[PDB]
Design a protein around this ligand. Structure first.
Ligand SMILES: [Mg+2]
Ligand SMILES: [Zn+2]
Ligand SMILES: [Zn+2]
Lengths: 492, 44, 471, 49, 93, 204, 100, 98, 50, 199
DNA sequence: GCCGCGTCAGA
DNA sequence: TCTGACGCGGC
DNA sequence: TAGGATTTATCCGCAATGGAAGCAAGG
DNA sequence: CCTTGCTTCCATTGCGGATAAATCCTACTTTTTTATT
């Protein structure tokens, strides 16, 4: 059919317009590969992971390439199989890097972002002051939901005794939950469209720029919710997705030292408190205990999503605050600023620069040893090409010996190949220029004098970095765009 | 008048090169760099 | 309220609104719990399935279809005692049960009395209460479906429906009598007459299993739940009164890996346990007892969820013993203990000590700021290991090409058996048996063939490229 | 011992002796830092001090 | 602007459309970019991502920072040609 | 996207829908049991199955129908307990057994309810005599030509259960080993677990 | 299993094990350069599971695929100096080797 | 220092070293802006895709280099997949579209 | 966890070379850039080169 | 010796012959017409159907089963991948190709002319529409041609014989894939004269 | 409606 | 720190 | 910041069978 | 030049004590804490 074409089209990493939205509990379950039910990580004796823990082969794929956990399936015969002793599936261990898990929170829990990001999405959706919402989340005070046939507004909040005498009046036809469960009931029972029309009319009529401003803000958020199609009740977590264990690794160091990522500790306290909440709910505990447990579970989930917007849970035994998911995406040194941009680059070296004033404007002196390292794969190719080496492994041995032939080959692969030179604080675009290298003894990069002012360079210890453009397009860009002999006028 | 960009005629020419600017040239970046590249040599 | 976010504050504020209670109030509350629990015992004891099940279970353990201690935990006023007491119970039960034809209720009451003598395990007791619950749920689904059918399809008011259907729910007097009154909903009582009547019949059946009217079992289980609710409220009062004790005990264990609040929560668990298992009649004040469970639960939970790489509690006991002993040694010998010296103070085989010493190192964070708190932590110094060097990937690729072109040399049969013999460019390599079995000559020929191809390859001018391609 | 050894090994003010001269050492020992516990920070302060 | 070019192409459809230019500092002017990836990668990320989430935004990538993040040919300079061709392949077969 | 624990779009009474269920029980693999209305599958799964046919299985990226394919997939994916022989001759033999059983008797089961009472009684007697003919072979090995529960049984049980629906009470030569074999496979735990309420309904 | 410090290091020619004393340490006074083995150390290793082509290699050439991985300590590249001192600490209990 | 290929980091798959084959040089923001200021799109792409992050593209590139054929397959930087997973691990559903 | 440690001490005699940083005492820094042969250096009437 | 009771042009027999040539094993081929099939076939196959194989103790009908048995007994070279999910998808394609397009060949031959040519148009548009698929990977969702090609390439071979020809775009990838398989030597050595007349 | 104040982001 | 913005509140 | 006491499950070493060498003898 | 065929000799999975691991239970009394540039 054409559905095969639809599928092979979905099997294509070529896309456009990445989207973003809230995650329903069902969607979060859909991402998952299984539920995490235990705070265990590895086995302290044979370090293979536990079953259903933060590192679980059955949930997050195997540890060793193409073999189950219980070693029963190693052979190449079984390569898609699911072992039965350990529920592991025999695939490549890189899947340990993409499968997510999930935790089933025993009680709903507010997503801190949509609560404590300063225009409180929850608040201005419910039109409830953040102070009173927090009053409700910490079980300080009830909140009416569907007062019914009584003198109770839909969001009028009561303290304990007020709700008491309320019950004494009407034991029913009136509902007042407490805690994130209540907030979820409110968010769910709302009507975006009815309230949208109502607020639209109210905005039409009343004339007081504070009220009209708040009103257009709220009507903006409401129409936004009805356009995006995201349910507001999703701003309250019920399933909590857990990160692939390969991204919060528990790598071992030499000598029993284990290095771990804080997310393991944050996840672990979430799971512990969740399990204890389940156990309490079963034991039918005094309501004060269960409330305290729900409170501290909410606290753990907040610490996990954004540690710091509260009492700032620091790590055990180390007097540093833990680092949460927010702290990983957000941050100048955080990923999205350190990752996805400003990346560490291969085929690149660094060294001290000197003058070498015998060069032509398009040349740079490149130390022989540096070049022999930067271009090593070009040299492997060229050696195998001229037969001087039977195999790439032989060629590796050759360039390690530095046989006098690799120097000729090196002078050959360098011939027209321009390299990029970049000085440390690249202020403007002349901070990166392409040069053609002249193989040079010693260990200093020899830089033409006339370009120094461009780099704002001094020969008083400053170092420059060299990069090697690889593809043909890159070499042609370097020669045509970034060659030194093209940047004679400044673009300022 | 352009939407999402500027016309090569409204912009001008000034460049390393000397002719009118070429389509697809990223002027915003080189502008940010020309304005901020000084500065960290003369405050006042 | 001071708009505080610290949960410690909130909990401490909320626990103090309850005040402590005297040592005799403890006896009073314990008496209350006893009231509720013995009441639920008796209310079950009325339900005949209880006594029939107990006697069955003793007769089954006498055939070893059960175990000895899982049936009783003593008698309120031993195999001989067990046999004589279950014979006495059989006597009472048979002289009360068959007398349904009133003296029946009172005789089953006396059977309840003798059942009150016993203290079975909370386990078979839990079996009992679960049976009570499934019976109640049969009653529940019955009423629910029946009223739904006979006020929705029949459109009857609820009052006139319940004042006749309820109360008997096995005899169909409501059914014929309402239609005799000739109401519109009594007419529509013909529509779902069949389903409702058959459900009422199943209810008859369950009652026959109970022998008592659904009215009677409803009264039973309502009494049961009342006693249970009494017990629960008393337990609530005791626990909310001793929360302070829990705080006191937990205070000690602060910095061992769990937050203060996790500690006091595990403590509260232990406290509920102690309240459950606490006997006042021993004249021992409550704190004397509850302290044990609280400290116990806190230490157990510290063992279970403090370390990232969990170690089982016996190993943590060993590690703690080692630390105690090492403190004594260090402060006495002055300098330090060496593992030999420890193994002397302990009796471990001098190598178990070293294992234990290797265990307890805890995982360092992958974010500790590396020297001078610079723009870099430990995390950015841990290289990957699973990957293969792109050089090695290229080597492998060229090796595949090489083997392919070497195998071009040997004749078709030879390269075929070779590629099949190892796993070259196909699925699992096969044992020589299968190589023959597909190769039509199931023989030791195939292994000689493989060897001959290995030679003819290892021969010069064919190997010599691979003796040159030696890797 | 924990407190003391912590102060001596892992502290802002306990530093590897700058040892490539006699001058380097003797100037490391006459150093007067304003940082360290209860002091400033390289970004908090501050054009004035 | 394009709104108006349209609702004045068809003159019957809109008889009214008026605005007032508005000026923001460079920071705020980056906050209010169309593409939440350009923004969240520079400014406060929590606020930008929260808002974009509850709005269900959709980021055509239309830009240099975005196309660098995801690692594909920048829509400027040498990449320009390619990107042109691409948007011609789209909006078509 | 594709959801979860690997749901299956099981017809409530469809024979093939029962085959796959018996298998899944035999592998003991966790899964969902989605039901279709009676014969028209939920109008939404047509986003997956352009044939709109059941049973249909989906594991998070993989859709499958045509029960034979599904059962082979399960036997290969979850390799224990092995539900097929290990030798090519026997595996092909069993594939052919399944092909013949389907193309002979399932067509007849369909015609029974799908033709006039003429075809009804005709095909009923036909399968009756055919079963009483295959009867003596049943005694050989505990299961159908195999010393252990094999995939071909997952073709027999779903039919033997549906004899009441076609009105054939086994009497005559062979109705002994046949009742003993239905005893074996019917009373098999996994087979019990395979049964839906409607599937139990055809039995007392 | 424990690691060994012997000079039994696979597939490194006597040009490589030239300067190691009989116990696996380097001789004092050795002029070394980049890559040279200073301290020959092997670590136990298992579970090879090598690709079919490497298996065919080991077959045609009888190269017994050893089980001890090489982990010796070698001079970093570019630095070429003289060994002027060698210290050896051993956890007590462990038997000392000749050089220690 | 200088490196062609070496060890890579653990969570992100980018270069890093201390083992006398250090990481490569950091190609931070300002250099990216420099390459954008030229029209050099291909240099930039291979700089932040194949030279650094694309776990599969980088080895395809190596094999091409030794084969005398200088071409590149871009794919998608692994750091971006990591960012996706860390967004999804909040309550936020972020995804590529087509 | 460790059995035995072996520490080896290398002595390297680093000679000066183009690239090394040199400095007088008055903040006159500088990176040496050419090792010139003797007969090229300037020299006074007594032929002593600088 | 294994004997195959092949049909002259029966696409089923075509596939069986193709996989036989692919595994490249000797076999006593026997052409058979459905009028008076050899007595021995009717003695063994109660269905009296072709193609049909014997291996000295074993007989199989239903070319699908036959190919499975061959690939399971004669491994080299493999024609089904290892990954049970990949195997399952290939089996699903082997089924769908048949179910959808063999029952179009069956219209164009064994149906009326109106049905014939309507279905010809339908099939033609289907093939031209999915043509971009083969445009990416060498074979039909693979890197090495497999049983799905044994199912597909025969029908593709008889396309002029069904008088179905190609438009501009789809023909490009169609012919690319064709010469890919149309050149494959096993395809040729499997062919018979009864077939080449079609193409 | 207009001013003081707490809160957060950012170097 | 400190600076700015800004909800948020008091006058 | 315990520990005995109970009870079970997991692992480590032992041996029994199937595959593959090793002659060893006819094609 | 071959081309089977009979011994033999080693990996591979039931099959076993020894250890690890998990559970349970204690009775004088002990009751709002901690925690911090
Ligand atoms: Mg300088
Ligand atoms: Zn396994
Ligand atoms: Zn313009």
């Amino acid at each position: 059919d054409l559905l095969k074409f639809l599928k092979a089209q979905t099997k294509t990493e070529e896309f456009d317009a990445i989207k973003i939205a809230l995650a329903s509990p069902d969607m979060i379950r859909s991402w998952s590969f299984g539920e995490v039910k235990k705070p265990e990580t590895i086995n302290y004796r044979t370090f293979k992971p536990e079953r259903d823990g933060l590192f679980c082969a059955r949930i997050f794929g195997p540890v060793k390439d193409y073999e189950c956990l219980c070693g029963k399936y190693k052979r190449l015969k079984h390569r898609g199989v699911i072992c039965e002793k350990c529920g592991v599936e025999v695939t490549q261990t890189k899947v340990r890097r993409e499968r997510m898990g999930h935790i089933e929170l025993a009680s709903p829990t507010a997503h801190i972002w949509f609560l404590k990001s300063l225009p409180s999405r929850i608040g201005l959706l419910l039109d409830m002051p953040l102070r009173d919402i927090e009053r409700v989340l910490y079980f300080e005070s009830y909140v009416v939901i569907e007062g019914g046939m009584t003198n109770l507004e839909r969001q009028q909040i009561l303290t304990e005794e007020q709700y008491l005498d309320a019950l004494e009046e009407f034991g029913d036809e009136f509902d007042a939950k407490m805690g994130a469960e209540a907030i979820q009931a409110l968010l769910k029972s709302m009507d975006l469209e009815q309230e949208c029309e109502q607020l639209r009319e109210e905005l039409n009529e009343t004339n007081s720029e504070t009220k009209r401003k708040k009103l257009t803000k709220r009507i903006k958020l409401l129409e936004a919710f009805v356009q995006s199609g995201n349910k507001p009740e999703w701003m309250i977590l019920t399933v909590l997705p857990v990160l692939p264990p390969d991204l919060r690794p528990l790598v071992p160091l030499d000598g029993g030292r284990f290095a771990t990522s804080d997310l393991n500790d944050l996840y672990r306290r979430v799971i512990n408190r969740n399990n204890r909440l389940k156990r309490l709910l079963d034991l039918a505990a005094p309501d004060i205990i269960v409330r305290n447990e729900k409170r501290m579970l909410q606290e753990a989930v907040d610490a996990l999503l954004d540690n710091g917007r509260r009492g700032r849970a620091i790590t055990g035994s180390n007097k540093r605050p833990l680092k949460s998911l927010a702290d990983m995406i957000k941050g100048k040194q955080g990923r999205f600023r350190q990752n996805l941009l400003g990346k560490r680059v291969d085929y690149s070296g660094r060294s001290v620069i000197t003058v070498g004033p015998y060069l032509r404007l398009h040349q740079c002196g490149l130390p022989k040893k540096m070049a022999l390292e930067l271009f090593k794969p070009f040299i492997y190719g060229k050696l195998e090409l001229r037969g001087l080496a039977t195999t790439i492994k032989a060629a590796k041995k050759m360039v390690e010996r530095e046989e006098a032939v690799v120097w000729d080959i090196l002078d050959e692969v360098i011939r027209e190949h321009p390299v990029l030179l970049n000085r440390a604080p690249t202020l403007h675009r002349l901070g990166i220029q392409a040069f053609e290298p002249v193989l040079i003894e010693g260990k200093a990069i020899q830089l033409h004098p006339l370009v120094c002012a461009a780099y704002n360079a001094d020969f008083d210890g400053d170092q420059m970095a060299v990069h090697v453009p690889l593809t043909l397009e890159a070499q042609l860009e370097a020669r045509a765009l970034m060659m030194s002999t093209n940047n004679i006028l400044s673009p300022a | 008048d352009t939407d999402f960009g500027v016309c090569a005629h409204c912009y001008g020419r000034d460049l390393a090169r000397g002719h009118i600017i070429n389509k697809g040239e990223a002027i915003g970046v080189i502008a940010a760099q020309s304005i901020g590249e000084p500065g960290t040599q003369l405050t006042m | 309220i001071g708009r505080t976010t610290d949960p410690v504050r909130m909990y401490m504020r909320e626990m103090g609104t309850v005040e402590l209670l005297t040592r005799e109030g403890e006896i009073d509350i314990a008496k209350r719990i006893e009231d509720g629990i013995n009441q639920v015992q008796c209310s079950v004891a009325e339900y005949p399935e209880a006594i029939t099940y107990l006697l069955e279970q003793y007769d089954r353990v006498e055939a070893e279809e059960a175990r000895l201690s899982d049936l009783i935990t003593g008698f309120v006023d031993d195999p001989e005692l067990a046999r004589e007491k279950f014979a006495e119970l059989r006597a009472q039960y048979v002289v009360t049960r068959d007398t349904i034809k009133a003296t029946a209720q009172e005789e089953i009451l006396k059977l309840s009395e003798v059942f009150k003598q016993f203290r079975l395990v909370p386990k078979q007791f839990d079996y009992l209460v679960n049976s009570m619950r499934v019976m109640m749920d049969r009653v529940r689904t019955q009423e629910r479906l029946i009223m739904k059918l006979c006020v929705e399809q029949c459109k009857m008011p609820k009052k006139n429906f319940i004042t006749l259907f309820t109360g008997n729910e096995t005899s169909d007097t409501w059914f014929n009598a309402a239609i005799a009154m000739n109401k519109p909903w009594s007419e529509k009582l013909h529509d779902v007459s069949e389903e409702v009547h058959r459900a009422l019949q199943k209810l008859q059946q369950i009652e026959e299993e109970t022998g008592l009217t659904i009215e009677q079992v409803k009264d039973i289980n309502r009494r049961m739940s009342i006693g249970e609710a009494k017990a629960r409220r008393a337990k609530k009062e005791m626990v909310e009164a001793n929360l302070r004790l829990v705080i006191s005990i937990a205070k000690k264990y602060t910095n061992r890996g769990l937050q203060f609040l996790d500690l006091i929560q595990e403590g509260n668990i232990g406290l509920m346990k102690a309240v459950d298992k606490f006997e006042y009649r021993r004249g021992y004040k409550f704190s004397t007892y509850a302290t044990w469970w609280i400290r116990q639960a806190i230490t157990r939970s510290i063992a279970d969820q403090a370390r990232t790489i969990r170690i089982p509690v016996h190993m943590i006991e060993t590690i703690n013993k080692l630390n105690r002993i090492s403190r004594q040694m260090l402060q006495e010998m002055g300098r330090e203990p060496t593992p030999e010296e420890l193994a002397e103070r302990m009796l471990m085989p001098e190598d178990k000590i070293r294992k234990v010493l290797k265990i307890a190192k805890e995982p360092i964070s992958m974010e500790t700021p590396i020297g001078d708190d610079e723009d870099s932590h430990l995390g950015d110094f841990i290289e990957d290991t699973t990957l293969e060097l792109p050089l090695d990937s290229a080597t492998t690729e060229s090796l595949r090409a090489a083997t392919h072109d070497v195998l071009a040399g040997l004749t078709a049969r030879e390269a075929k058996v070779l590629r099949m013999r190892f796993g070259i460019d196909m699925n699992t390599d096969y044992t020589l048996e299968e190589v023959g079995k597909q190769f039509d000559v199931t023989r030791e020929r195939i292994r000689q063939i493989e060897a001959k191809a290995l030679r003819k390859l290892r021969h010069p001018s064919r190997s010599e490229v691979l003796r040159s391609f030696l890797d | 011992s924990a407190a003391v050894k912590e102060f001596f090994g892992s502290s802002q003010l306990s530093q590897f002796m700058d040892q490539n001269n006699p001058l380097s050492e003797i100037t490391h020992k006459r150093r007067i830092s304003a940082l360290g516990p209860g002091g400033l920070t390289r970004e908090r302060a501050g054009f004035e001090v | 602007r394009v709104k108006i070019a349209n609702r004045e192409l068809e003159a019957n459809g809109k008889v009214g459309a008026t605005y007032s230019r508005d000026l923001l500092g460079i920071t705020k002017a980056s906050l209010a970019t169309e593409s939440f990836i350009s923004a969240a990668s520079f400014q406060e990320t929590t606020r930008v991502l929260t808002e974009a989430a509850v709005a269900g935004k959709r980021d055509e990538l239309r830009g240099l920072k975005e196309n660098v993040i995801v690692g594909r040919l920048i829509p400027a300079g040498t990449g320009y040609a390619y990107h042109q061709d691409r948007m011609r392949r789209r909006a078509a077969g | 996207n594709k959801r979860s624990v690997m749901t299956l779009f099981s017809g409530p009474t469809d024979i093939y829908s029962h085959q796959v269920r018996i298998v899944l029980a035999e592998k003991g693999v966790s899964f969902e049991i989605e039901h279709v209305e009676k014969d028209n599958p939920p109008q939404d799964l047509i986003d997956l199955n352009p044939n709109q046919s059941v049973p249909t299985l989906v594991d998070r990226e993989l859709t499958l129908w045509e029960s034979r394919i599904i059962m082979e997939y399960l036997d290969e994916r979850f390799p224990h307990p092995p539900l097929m022989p290990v030798y090519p001759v026997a595996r092909g033999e069993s594939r052919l057994y399944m092909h013949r059983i389907e193309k002979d008797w399932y067509t007849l089961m369909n015609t029974i309810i799908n033709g006039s009472a003429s075809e009804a009684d005709a095909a009923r007697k036909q399968l009756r005599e055919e079963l009483l003919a295959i009867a003596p072979v049943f005694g050989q090995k505990p299961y159908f030509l195999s010393d252990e529960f094999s995939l071909v049984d997952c073709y027999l049980a779903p039919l033997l259960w549906r004899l009441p629906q076609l009105g054939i009470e086994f009497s005559g030569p062979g109705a002994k080993e046949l009742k003993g074999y239905m005893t074996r496979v019917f009373e098999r735990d996994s087979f019990l677990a395979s049964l839906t309420e409607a599937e139990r309904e055809m039995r007392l | 299993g424990p690691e060994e410090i012997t000079a039994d290091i696979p597939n490194v020619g006597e040009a490589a094990l030239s300067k190691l004393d009989e116990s696996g340490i380097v001789y004092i006074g050795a002029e070394v350069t980049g890559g040279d083995i200073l301290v020959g150390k092997v670590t136990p290793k298992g579970e090879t599971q090598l690709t079919p082509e490497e298996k065919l290699l080991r077959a045609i050439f009888g190269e017994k695929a050893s089980d001890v991985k090489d982990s010796s300590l070698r001079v970093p590249n570019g630095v070429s100096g003289t060994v002027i001192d060698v210290q050896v600490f051993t956890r007590d209990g462990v038997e000392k080797d000749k050089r220690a | 220092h200088a490196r062609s290929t070496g060890s890579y980091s653990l969570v992100t798959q980018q270069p890093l070293g201390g083992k006398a084959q250090f990481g490569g040089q950091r190609f931070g923001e300002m250099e990216v802006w420099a390459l954008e200021a030229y029209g050099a799109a291909y240099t930039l792409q291979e700089m932040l895709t194949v030279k650094s992050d694309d776990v599969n593209g980088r080895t395809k590139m190596y094999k091409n280099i030794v084969d005398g054929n200088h071409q590149m397959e871009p794919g998608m930087p692994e750091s971006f997949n990591v960012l996706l997973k860390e967004i999804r691990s909040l309550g936020i559903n972020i995804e590529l579209e087509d | 966890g460790v059995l035995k440690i072996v520490k080896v001490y290398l002595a390297v005699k680093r000679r000066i070379q183009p690239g090394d940083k040199m400095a007088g005492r008055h903040g006159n820094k500088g990176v040496i850039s050419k090792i010139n042969p003797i007969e090229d250096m300037p020299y006074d009437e007594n032929g002593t080169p600088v």
